[PDB]
């Protein structure tokens, strides 16, 4: 959806959190080489954690990550949405708290494929 946060309309995507298919955010959506990775990494990094929200809720977020890591999607839903906290996204790597807070979770705690990037799946020699 092109920039849809249910603005001008009461609920659109669904402000409550569906299945957590979303990826951890802070890195390049299309990382190319080391330079591309590192440069865009920092760029997106700037926009990732922002201010934070609630260390009190953090406990639930990491516990949900625990279940979700163990393939327990339902557990993490019952935790996040179980509090009051919700998402129009549907991520375990994101949570929006009732106080107007948002948490954005980097891949370093879930998925490390976006660390090397330039494997021999395509990259060989970036000379041009």
From Swiss-Prot:
A cellular component annotation (GO) from this entry: cytoplasm
Superkingdom classification of source: Eukaryota
Subcellular location per the Swiss-Prot or TrEMBL entry: Cytoplasm
Presence of keyword Glycoprotein: no
UniProt-annotated stretches for the region Disordered: 1-33
Polar residues composition bias: residue spans: 1-8
Biased composition range(s): Basic and acidic residues: 19-28
Tissue specificity as recorded in UniProt: Detected in dendritic cells. Highly expressed in tumor cell lines, but not detectable in most tissues.
Keywords per UniProt: Cytoplasm
Main location (coarse class): cytoplasm
UniProt key word Cytoplasm: yes
Protein name as annotated: Ubiquitin domain-containing protein 2
Protein's gene: UBTD2
Residues of the full protein shown: 14 to 141 of 234
């Amino acid at each position: 959806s092109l920039n849809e946060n249910s603005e001008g309309t009461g609920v659109a995507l669904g402000r409550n959190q569906p299945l957590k298919k979303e990826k951890p955010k802070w890195k390049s959506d299309y990382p190319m080489t080391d330079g591309q990775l590192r440069s865009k990494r920092d760029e997106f990094w700037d926009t990732a954690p922002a201010f934070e929200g609630r260390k009190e809720i953090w406990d639930a977020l990491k516990a949900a990550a625990h279940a979700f890591e163990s393939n327990d999607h339902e557990l993490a839903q019952a935790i996040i949405d179980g509090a009051n906290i919700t998402l129009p996204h549907g991520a375990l790597t994101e949570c929006y708290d009732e106080l107007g807070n948002r948490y954005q979770l980097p891949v370093y705690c879930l998925a490390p494929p976006i660390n090397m990037i330039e494997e021999k799946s395509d990259i060989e020699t970036l000379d041009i």
